[PDB]
């Protein structure tokens, strides 16, 4: 069988306790009521978890599929990369990054210590002389916030130690960079920033006669990636014009971690073996966007859409096409629904016909409209606010290494949830601890920055231009889910966060320099008198460089 996991009996162990229940201080009630609602994932769940991924994969690869990678390799072809220096992929490891089990940690990487420094070039030189060995790789479940909808089983990760993280840099992170936009063009989806997103998905459904969309939900996709599919991605790299170093270094790191390897738990004990795709290297995010493109365009080919443009970030997938009617649409979906479980990527839930922009989900976000101080329709991103809303009830109560909620205000800060509710929530308690010019972790497309809660105005017109502060009359749907999710979790009415945003706003004006900036755009919308909003000189000047070039989810990179 080529199954995607083989276990020992050894537990997936945890590496500390472990809470699940929502803690509770002070704050909560502030935010949510309804406590209950929201747990984490831990161990306890990681056998239920092993179970669902764990099965036998089939591949029958026709000519389409064949004809999309030639294509693939062609543009691939065009591609030149350099590898770095030991420096520089120290200097992209998260200083929280999980420490070696050779004596050092991120830290000492960071600083460039001999001992770290002396590990990562012996790491590397057994990369270019050994291409066979399985790489040891530590099984985690992951602790991950939610809401019930009762309880979704913790993911896995599934990560090498830090000695061949940074090798993996060294060899790839220029590649994975800049590849994913030159073989796949305007379909890449971590190129944009959340407005950039919306304007692709719009012209692109204004650009057919009848539009028809879907968003198409892989099974437990990394479970799905086969050793063909892993090796088809290693080609497709080889294809970069790179150094003959690190066409060895990506052979090697392809044979002995890519495809597969036992899995060690914290506690030292063999867990098993992975054929499938690791959830914790750096070529998670490019690897399964190539392979999703690839599976998903040959499909399009197979099922005869016409004029389909596609959108894809890792294993998610939206497709916007030319409507043929309804049932010719339906037949359609059915024969890419069958293409793509030939290539190994079933369906979750089955994919459904969409005529309507606003209703596709896709990355767990859609299209809405609002208006501008103007009156004009605006389109922007949004999404469903549960999530965002129950990971900011345990970081009010709980420090976390990524402050959800502040990646969630810079990605949604058009949105009405992430004003009302998230700016005003958390400018609250950083006001009652003077923790303003503070800077905090946090994670755009799955690389990490550390960002100054004081830059939000500036770095949300950078991203978002200066309508996001102007932005009113919110769509029914938009304001019904809202209000649908405020009443699951029991987050005070729009009519309360308005009230306690006038009191944030004024105190904020009140200390002013940039926490009065803070106050003065990103509660605007609180004021009946409602004052001038200038370019932000400070705008101008910040390095958003590789903000929105490429994803990293599971890769361990730090942009800052
Ligand atoms: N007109 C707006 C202006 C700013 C923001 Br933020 C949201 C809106 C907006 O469309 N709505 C509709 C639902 C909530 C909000 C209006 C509202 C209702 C009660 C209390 C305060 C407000 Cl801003
Ligand atoms: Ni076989």
């Given at each position: 069988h080529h199954m995607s996991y083989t276990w020992t009996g050894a537990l997936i162990t945890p590496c500390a306790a472990e809470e699940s229940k929502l803690p509770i201080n002070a704050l909560s009630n502030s935010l949510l009521?309804?406590?209950?609602?929201v747990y984490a994932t831990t161990s306890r769940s990681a056998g239920l978890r092993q179970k669902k991924v764990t099965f036998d994969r089939l591949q029958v690869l026709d000519d389409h599929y064949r004809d999309v990678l030639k294509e693939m390799k062609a543009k691939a072809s065009t591609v030149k990369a350099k590898l770095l220096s030991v420096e520089e992929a120290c200097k992209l490891t998260?200083?929280?990054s999980a420490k070696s089990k050779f004596g050092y940690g991120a830290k000492d990487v960071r600083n460039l210590s001999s001992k770290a420094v002396n590990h990562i070039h012996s790491v590397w030189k057994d990369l270019l002389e050994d291409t066979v060995t399985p790489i040891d790789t530590t099984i985690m479940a992951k602790n991950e916030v939610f809401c019930v909808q009762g309880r979704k089983p913790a993911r896995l990760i599934v990560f090498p130690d830090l000695g061949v993280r940074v090798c993996e840099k060294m060899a790839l992170y220029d590649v994975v960079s800049t590849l994913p936009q030159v073989v796949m063009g305007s379909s890449?989806?971590?190129?944009?920033?959340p407005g950039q997103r919306v304007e692709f998905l719009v012209n692109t459904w204004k650009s057919k006669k009848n539009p028809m969309g879907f968003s198409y939900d892989t099974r437990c996709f990394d479970s799905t990636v086969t050793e063909n599919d892993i090796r088809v991605e290693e080609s497709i790299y080889q294809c970069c014009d790179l150094a003959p170093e690190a066409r060895q270094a990506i052979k090697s790191l392809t044979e002995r971690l890519y495809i597969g390897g036992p899995l060690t738990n914290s506690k030292g004990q063999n867990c098993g073996y992975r054929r499938?795709?690791?959830?914790?290297?750096?070529?998670?995010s490019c690897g399964n966007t190539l392979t999703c493109y690839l599976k998903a365009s040959a499909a399009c080919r197979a099922a005869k859409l016409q004029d389909c443009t596609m959108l894809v970030n890792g294993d998610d997938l939206v497709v916007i096409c030319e409507s043929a009617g309804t049932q010719e649409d339906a037949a359609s979906l059915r024969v890419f629904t069958e293409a793509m479980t030939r290539y190994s990527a079933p369906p979750g839930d089955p994919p459904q016909p969409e005529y309507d922009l606003e209703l596709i989900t896709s990355c767990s976000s859609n299209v809405s409209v609002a208006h501008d101080a103007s009156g004009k329709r605006v389109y922007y991103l949004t999404r469903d606010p549960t999530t965002p809303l129950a990971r900011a009830a345990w970081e009010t109560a709980r420090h976390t290494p990524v402050n959800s909620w502040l990646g969630n205000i810079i990605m949604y800060a058009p949105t009405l949830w992430a004003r009302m509710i998230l700016m005003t929530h958390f400018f609250s308690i950083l006001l009652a601890q003077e923790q303003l010019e503070k800077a905090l972790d946090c994670q755009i497309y799955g690389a990490c920055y550390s960002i100054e809660p004081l830059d939000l105005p500036q770095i949300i017109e950078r991203l978002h231009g200066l309508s996001a502060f102007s932005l009113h009359s919110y769509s029914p749907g938009e304001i019904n889910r809202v209000a649908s999710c405020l009443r699951k979790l029991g987050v005070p009415p729009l009519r309360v966060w308005r009230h306690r945003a006038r009191s944030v706003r004024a105190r904020l004006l009140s200390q002013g320099g940039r926490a009065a900036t803070c106050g003065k755009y990103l509660f605007?919308?609180?004021?009946?008198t409602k004052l001038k909003l200038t370019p932000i000189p400070a705008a101008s000047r910040?390095?958003?460089?590789?903000?929105?070039?490429?994803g990293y989810s599971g890769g361990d990179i730090y942009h800052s």
């Open positions: 009521r309804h406590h209950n609602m998260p200083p929280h890449y989806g971590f190129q944009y920033s499938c795709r690791a959830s914790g290297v750096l070529t998670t605007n919308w609180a004021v009946k910040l390095d958003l460089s590789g903000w929105f070039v490429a």
